[PDB]
Structure 1
Amino acid sequence: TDPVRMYMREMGTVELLTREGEIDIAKRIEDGINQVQCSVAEYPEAITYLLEQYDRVEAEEARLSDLITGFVDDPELAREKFAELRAQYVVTRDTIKATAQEEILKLSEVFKQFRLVPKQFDYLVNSMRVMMDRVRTQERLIMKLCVEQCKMPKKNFITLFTGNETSDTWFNAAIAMNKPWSEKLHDVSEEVHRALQKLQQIEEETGLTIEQVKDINRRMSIGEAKARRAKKEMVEANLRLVISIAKKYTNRGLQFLDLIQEGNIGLMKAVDKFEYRRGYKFSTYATWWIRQAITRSIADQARTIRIPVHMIETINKLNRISRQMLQEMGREPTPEELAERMLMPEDKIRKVLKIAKEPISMETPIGDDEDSHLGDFIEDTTLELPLDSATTESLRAATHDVLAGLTAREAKVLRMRFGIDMNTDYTLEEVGKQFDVTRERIRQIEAKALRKLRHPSRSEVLRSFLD
């Protein structure tokens, strides 16, 4: 068993790539992403929304960083380059008068130059497939209302449906066929004709008949899967590379397979950002992406008390220095000796050195004959001792007796100035609004009540709470 073996054994079946096979995959990766880019460029909502979002960039409702990251070959170039996309869209929109297919070729051209933010790319991709959920939503209602409910075979229902999927040529014209499956479609006539509104509406928002709505995002599906299928294919060939690299950062405070998994995520990023046209060996390019993810992970989740990376490199400075200072002196550095050899505020070393120690296993055996564990000895300091809580229940009855020895409105003015038997304490002005005559009048009621209680007759009980 043990997962190290069955992972080692599982990926050992995967065969190393030839130095030529690296290019075969990076080419298939090229095709799939380019295939979806040609499909993204064919979507009118993807053009209008990219124009929707740039009319948001020129009205100071965002920044140029929030939409694009550059084109093929900054505020100057973006305004005129976006007019090129706007120019190429508005000429295509009006020539649908069929023969537009010659000019819709150019709309994809200027749109394939834009490198959007990966945030926006996924949204438009989400906008397309969610728009296909809207298409299929009305598709499956018409299917359940005709086949399952009205008993109509699926051979004759899709006949005039292809090439249409919007009008009533398949519904109200196929009820007049007098077929055994025809006269039964009247029962649901009232239910289908009203839900057809959301279907033929997608031909308006997206500006494409339901026929074209699938054609595009189907090639986008084919292209999208084609990339990952090749991308996955690339990752596996280098699972050995991650292993060998991760074999270096072993005991740094993170489990073995935890490293070769975080490195495996670095190898995953390397395949995405790889460009085979630059001729650098994919192995050596991934070495930095894999060794990044390992060490960038040890910084985060190898500590119980998570610390920033600038602390970890601050720390190593002391350990590397205290390897020198230790032997270089013969004794070892005082907290104020490496204070000098460190640029740091040099008092911070103490504060730094405090938190650098990982917390201690509370289940450490302390070494007694009862096998007492450390945690068995840490006392509760948050607790109020009963010999105290007893007096708290007594200081209560003490002040209550002493407050019934005042004039009645001295209690309501004292219990208001302190928190006694009421929610919160009250600013002496707030108490004044409660008592008509306000302000300085209350200050004397406050002073005189403490004065009647301070003479050794009412104080004799209260004074013994001070020690």
Structure 2
Amino acid sequence: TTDPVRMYMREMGTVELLTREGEIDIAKRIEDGINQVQCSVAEYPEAITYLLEQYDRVEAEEARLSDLITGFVDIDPELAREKFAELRAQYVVTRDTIKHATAQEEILKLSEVFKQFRLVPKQFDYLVNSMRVMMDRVRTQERLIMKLCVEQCKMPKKNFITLFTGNETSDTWFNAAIAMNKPWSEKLHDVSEEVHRALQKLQQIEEETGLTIEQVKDINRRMSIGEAKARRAKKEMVEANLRLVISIAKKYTNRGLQFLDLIQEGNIGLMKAVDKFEYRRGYKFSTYATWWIRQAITRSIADQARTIRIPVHMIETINKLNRISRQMLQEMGREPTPEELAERMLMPEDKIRKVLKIAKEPISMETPIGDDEDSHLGDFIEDTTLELPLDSATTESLRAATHDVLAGLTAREAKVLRMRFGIDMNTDYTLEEVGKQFDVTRERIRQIEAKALRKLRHPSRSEVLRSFLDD
């Protein structure tokens, strides 16, 4: 059988439950992952100095304490001043000791006091994705040199990697292996300028971040392995806690959205919970995650389960009306009138009518009217956007009559009266515009217009046009 809810259950039924300590173990793997990505940030000085310039934007009254970061390990603005002043002293004493191994412990201490700061995920993920873009440009240059030389000139990748991976900076791979007189060294002589230029752009990327790609590759593969560890841990916890999503989403099934839609919105909420979970508060995962799952499911039912999308607070008002009219129906007995809902609630009872009106789901246009024939509701809905053909006959006869009457005028009067209104042309024209048409006075056009209408109001011209006004 197809029944893809059951195929979902059998696809998740192989994943077994967690003990109460395995959740802490997965959370510690998550801690190890974020630890390794923040230590991968800790070696990269350009992200450091970027956040230092953003903190100078904080100190220039263009930012806020709640923009850059949030919180410290023992959020006060005087605390921000003193901790970033110690940071300031640290990075003015740290960077200028390259003049190598003397500076490395200083950079590690600057890295530790950088790790003492609790970031906003905006700036953090910005630094992560900027490192990713830098790595992608480096890989683009590497694959560019490979696609220049390796596949076309039939150079082996082992002899490519040999003096490239290991130095990667200078012309020890490039200029020496030409001079070493290999059978592939000749084929470089058509491509030596582009390979050398890509090598100098690799050196340029090194000079931007200060260190070589020999360090940068290990930095971001450390970042990649730490983030892959974290993502595998979070996959494992989500695969475990699918059951909670099912047990919550059993309740909201008949509220208009399908069952699997509910459990998928619950799984999005569960992934948000695994994002924002903190075990050191000591609560179980269930108590924390249940609110996120119910929040995502309730927000989704309020968002996308209606044809006309009615907003969140409006649906809260509708659910209050149904709850209070459920309570009052067993108090009074008949059903509550909205006059009782005036004093029962805080709304002025004329808005309660329109809230009661908006909350109606539209009828299906194939909802059958009685006796179950081919007569559905769709065959009865009249079209009100057409015009009746008698109105088209009136419009045709009116154009004919007005053309015959405007033929009876002079040349200038008929031309002005056609130009002024929408008669058998494009857009109408106003006073100054007709004045620029005929190079004639504005007020003279009004006088000609009044004389033309005065000519048309008299009988033997007014009869056939007064016939088009019915009494």
Structure 1 residue 343: Cα displacement: 1.2
Do the aligned partners of residues 51 and 425 (structure 1) sit closer, same or farther apart at CA in structure 2, a change above 3 Å counting?
farther
Q: What is aligned with 2:82?
A: 80
- Equivalent residue of 2:70, what SS? strand
Give the alignment's Cα RMSD to 1 decimal.
2.3
Q: How far off its partner does 1:37 sit?
A: 0.7
**1:126-163 per-position Cα deviation (integer Å, ceiling 9, x unaligned):** 11011011111221222233322333223333222233
**1:76 Cα shift?**
5.3
Q: Tell me the distance in 2 between the aligned counterparts of 1:44 and 1:153.
A: 36
Give the superposition deviation at 1:328: 3.8
Matches within 5 A, 1:153-172: 153-172=156-175
Per-residue CA distance 1:314-348 (angstroms, 9 max, x = gap): 11222223234445444433343323323112101
Unaligned runs of 5+ in 1: none
Aligned partners of 1:39 and 1:219 also within 8 Å? yes
Q: How far 1:60 moved relative to its partner?
A: 5.2
Deviates more, 1:297-306 or 1:404-413: 404-413
Partner of 2:153: 150
1:399 touches 1:462 (CA, 8 Å); kept in 2? yes
Once residues 460 and 70 of structure 1 are traced to their aligned partners in structure 2, the CA distance between those partners, rounded to angstroms, is 87
Question: Kindly tell me: are residues 148 and 317 of structure 1, through their superposed partners in 2, closer, same or farther at Cα, counting changes over 3 Å?
Answer: closer
CA, structure 1 residues 447+83, in 2 after alignment: closer, same or farther (shift >3 Å)? farther
How many Å apart are 1:62 and its aligned residue?
4.8
Q: How far apart, in 1, do the equivalents of 2:323 and 2:150 lie?
A: 77
- Aligned 8 A contact 1:364 1:373 in 2: yes
More displaced stretch, 299-308 vs 413-422: 413-422
Say if 1:39 and 1:217, in contact at 8 Å, map to a contact too.
yes
What CA distance in whole angstroms lies between the structure 2 residues aligned with 1:409 and 1:61?
67
Which deviates more, 91-100 or 419-428? 419-428
Q: Which moved more, 1:78-87 or 1:131-140?
A: 78-87
- Structure 1 residue 231: deviation in Å? 0.9
Preserved CA contact (<8 Å) 2:266 2:297: yes
Q: 1:419/1:59 Cα in 2 relative to 1: closer, same or farther (>3 Å)?
A: farther
How far off is 1:368 after superposition?
5.0
Q: Pick closer, same or farther for the CA change 1:153–1:331 going to 2, 3 Å.
A: closer
Q: TM-score, normalised by structure 2?
A: 0.92
Alignment partner of 1:184 out of 173, 184, 187: 187
CA-to-aligned-CA distance 1:30-71 (integer Å, 9 cap, x gap): 000111011112212212222333344444555554433344
| Cα distance, 1:77 vs structure 2 | 4.8
Residue 62 to residue 425, structure 1, CA distance change in 2 (3 Å) = farther
Q: Deviations over 1:98-136 (max 9, x none)?
A: 321111112212321333332222221111011011111
- Secondary structure of the 1:382 match is coil
Evaluate the alpha carbon distance shift between residue 24 and residue 325 of structure 1 in structure 2; reply closer, same or farther with a 3 A threshold.
closer
Residue 201 (structure 1) shift? 0.6
In structure 2, list runs of 5 or more residues that go unmatched.
none
Does the Cα contact within 8 Å between 1:44 and 1:206 map onto a contact in 2?
A: yes
Secondary structure of the residue that 1:196 maps to in structure 2?
A: helix
Relative distance call for 1:179 and 1:244 in structure 2 (3 A) is same
**Identical columns (%):** 100
| Counterpart contact for 2:42–2:108, Cα < 8 Å | no
1:442 CA displacement? 2.8
User: Which digits, 9 at most, give the CA deviation of each residue in 1:280-306, with x for residues without a partner?
Assistant: 111111111112211121111111111
Does the aligned pair in 2 maintain the 1:153–1:181 contact within 8 Å?
no
Q: In the superposition, relative to structure 1, how do residues 190 and 276 fare at CA in structure 2: closer, same or farther (>3 Å)? A: same
- Say which SS state the counterpart of residue 59 (structure 2) adopts: coil
Q: Larger deviation: 317-326 or 250-259?
A: 317-326
Partner of 1:257: 260
Distance (Å, rounded) in 2 between the aligned partners of 1:367 and 1:393: 43
* 3-state SS in 1 of match to 2:339: coil
- What do the CA deviations read for 1:427-465 (whole angstroms, capped 9, x no partner)? 434434444443433333222212211112112221122
Given that residues 174 and 196 in structure 2 are in contact (C-alpha distance below 8 angstroms), is that contact kept between their aligned partners in structure 1? no
Deviates further, 170-179 or 15-24: 170-179
